[PDB]
Design a protein around this nucleic acid. Structure first.
Lengths: 50, 123, 60
RNA sequence: UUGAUCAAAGUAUCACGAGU
RNA sequence: UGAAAAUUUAUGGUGGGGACACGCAAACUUCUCAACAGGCCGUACCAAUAUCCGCAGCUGGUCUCCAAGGUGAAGAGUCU
RNA sequence: GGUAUGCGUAGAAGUGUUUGGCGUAAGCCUGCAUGGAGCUGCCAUUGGUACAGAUCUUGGUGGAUAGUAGCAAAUAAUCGAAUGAGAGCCUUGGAGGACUGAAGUGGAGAAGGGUUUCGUGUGAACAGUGGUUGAUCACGAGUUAGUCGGUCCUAAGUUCAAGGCGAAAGCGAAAAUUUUCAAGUAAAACAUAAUUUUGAACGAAAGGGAAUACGGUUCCAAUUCCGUAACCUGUUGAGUAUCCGUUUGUUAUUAAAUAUGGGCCUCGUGCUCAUCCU
RNA sequence: GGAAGACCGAAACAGUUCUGACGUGCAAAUCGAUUGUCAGAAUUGAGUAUAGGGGCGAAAGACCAAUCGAACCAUCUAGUA
RNA sequence: UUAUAUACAACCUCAACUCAUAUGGGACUACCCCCUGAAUUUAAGCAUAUUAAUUAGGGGAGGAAAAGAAACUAACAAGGAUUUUCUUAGUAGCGGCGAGCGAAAAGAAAACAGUUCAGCACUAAGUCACUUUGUCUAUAUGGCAAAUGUGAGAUGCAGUGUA
RNA sequence: AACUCUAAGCGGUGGAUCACUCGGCUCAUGGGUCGAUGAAGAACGCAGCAAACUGUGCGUCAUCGUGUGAACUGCAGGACACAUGAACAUCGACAUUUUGAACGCAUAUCGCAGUCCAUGCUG
RNA sequence: UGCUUGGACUACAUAUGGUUGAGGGUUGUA
């Protein structure tokens, strides 16, 4: 940490803003197939590296 | 507040248009306050409609900013790059079709005097 | 405080706030909150009151 | 005999002048 | 036989530019002193017997920084 | 593909079965009970055609045990108060016992982590025991600089202009040969003059290196924020040796004048001599 | 008077004998007793070279990402018996 | 204009340009094109054969690509551009004459389209392209002349003429 | 009654059977469409409550004209600006951040430039 | 003048002109 760079500050928001759960109403679409997420990150059961 | 029909906006002027432009974006930023402060309606949801209303203005502003160019860039060669008929690749840079049918002299004398005659060789 | 687009070169805020509100800047400060947003810091002048600024604008 | 030297002087005839 | 180079001083140097004495001065002046801006991004926390890598909160390998009272050779080892 | 005026929500396929039966046997026919939309018999053809097996592939699930194996290293926890549906803990806060011993289980830095840091709220998996707090979720905030630092310089070395070679890609390469392959330099006609060899660039938050620190401050941030106190770099501006002998001030001695003299001359007024610090 | 690849020793490292402690661990190599150097052939964080029949090796065929008498990953590969 | 003592005009090789004005590396790949060329396998083993003028092979194209108008056939009562299919034929020879390889004109079917270059004699550069200025319009890197404004062009442009 | 043996009922772990399939692969006729005007792939930024897949490019879940002719919808809220078009699809208009074949020198650095006008303050 | 804020620009290989050309290359006029 603490000496990142301006990709790995902007890359790390996208692997941060994707760490919500499901939108908390959108399981009332038509044909709701979304229970909880596929990409769902913890941070010791899942690594980043890309 | 009415939907700005772009058919209506084709009669206006650019000085009125920029006057029409900033009259909406200045009010727009005040609407974003209610998004973050949680304003008085459930939502001041006009920032969908006024957004596309704002985007209706730029293009017709660009249109006469475009349409005035190509009439005064008539009657030249060495044309503007961004105004040069963006069609394809494999027929721009290979031998233009008014210029690739330029038949040769010893091939337009054998197409002069013995022509194709439309008969039916039959008994 | 301000939240801005991602090319705020610290003088565009010095350009814009006096263009939008006639507010003298004092010291324009910038940090990037790592969720992808550039939170801004600007300091008023003495004659401008901060509670008078947003109450003019509408921010409580 | 652990200094040091660049960047024309000299000369010649013309410019042999301009301003005056 | 114990790195390079960015940046830097002073000196040397032929030219050249200052350069009147009844003064008006001037001085990238290496002096005193006043206005004037200085963009870009990185900053929270763990920093390892619970945030690292060890398929895991696993006695395992992890770069250095500060470093006290006593006894005593002492950064020992025992003790607050 | 032909076929049976084929049965089918008035229950069609498989699933069970202590209903009943036919074959030598593989296999059907049949009753009931689920079940909810399609199915079989004769005769022509035919395809990836019937499984106990392959240290067979995949997905449940046993006995041992579904409570045995063992969760034993780092001295060692404890009563009372809370609160809690419920506490050996952790969750606290009250005591007060012992450890870590300053080449710590302590305070902050690197690589790597990437939202863990913080408040607020909590039910279940998560914490190889519990759970009222957690490095889990829910939900909110949170990282401010001219001086800290990347940024410039260059190190071993990437071989990274087209001289070259290779069928092309590209070359486990001190590319030192490549009209001028000069950076140029206030410059002068009449290749501006002797001059410059590799032209380019990356490469160190550990080496080189513009310049600062002090006190307090928040729910978490500080050589950054305010309070106050300096500096650097660049730009601009103002003052800043520098007015003489003499005589304007002043009788002169003196004084603005950084230190005036000189011969001459009627003294010199005239003349001459000149300051790029003492 | 303080020189030497000099000695006994500590964090730095190494890994000897016990063939001791678990050998469905604490672990796809570690813990606990013991032992050696310890001011240089020393110990090491970063940068950079070296390439699959070769790199590198104070030389064991060690080491090259838990693989090393030739890796490691897709194919000609349902390769042959 | 060359004791290496000056100009000017050409020429000739030859530069430099934030000149003008414009063309190209790249993506994909089944098919296609010129390339480089391996191996298990088969021979009961293997070394020439085979896998094969083959998978990476990568440079190139397109709606076609390459070929194509014979320096061919055949040897006959002749035929006649190139490509794909049926057959020639699993026959001719190549073969450790081992395993295994392997065509072909000729016969019939689709479609059919033949011709510019070079070079005598072809006999007033009669050529071509920019430029600018207008004609004419058009999303033309455009049609008509001109100044005959350049330059290209005799080291050869054009017309007619070609196995 | 414990327990163990055995049938069925019944509850329970399980997902096999049969059915159903907004999909797969095969078969064959059609057409020429690949960039220096910025392609192909990525990074991000996206919207009211939004992570994705899909859509886009500061005009950011869509976009001018066009066509057809009233809605998308879990909900709030705007529309009925149908009647001078909802919402679709078509699509010619305009747009096209960021990077490539990097067309500035150049990337483990959003860093270093250089030319010229425009536009603000020095002044 | 310098600051900050916009734009346009500023690859290399390369073809045909354009400009300025360099040459004890080759002559010619002197």
């Amino acid at each position: 940490a603490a000496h990142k760079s301006f990709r790995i500050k902007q890359k790390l928001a996208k692997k941060l803003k994707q760490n919500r759960s499901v939108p908390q109403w959108v399981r009332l679409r038509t044909g709701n197939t979304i229970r909880y997420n596929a990409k769902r990150r913890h941070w010791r059961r899942t690594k980043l590296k890309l | 507040m009415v939907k700005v029909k772009c058919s209506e906006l084709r009669i206006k002027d650019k000085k009125e248009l920029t006057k029409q432009l900033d009259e909406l974006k200045n009010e727009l930023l005040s609407l974003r306050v209610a998004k973050v402060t949680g304003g008085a309606p459930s939502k001041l949801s006009k920032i969908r409609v006024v957004r596309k209303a704002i985007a209706r203005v730029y293009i017709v502003m660009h249109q006469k900013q475009k349409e005035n160019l190509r009439k005064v860039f008539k009657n030249k060669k060495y044309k503007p790059l961004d105004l040069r008929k963006k069609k394809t690749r494999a027929i721009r840079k290979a031998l233009s079709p008014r210029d690739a049918n330029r038949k040769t002299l010893k091939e337009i004398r054998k197409r002069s005097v013995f022509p194709q005659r439309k008969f039916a060789v039959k008994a | 405080v301000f939240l801005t687009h991602l090319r705020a070169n610290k003088n565009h805020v010095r350009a814009a706030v006096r263009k939008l509100y006639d507010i003298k800047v004092a010291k324009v400060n910038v940090l990037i909150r790592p969720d992808g947003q550039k939170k801004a810091y600007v300091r008023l002048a003495r004659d401008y009151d901060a509670l008078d600024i947003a109450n003019k604008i509408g921010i409580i």
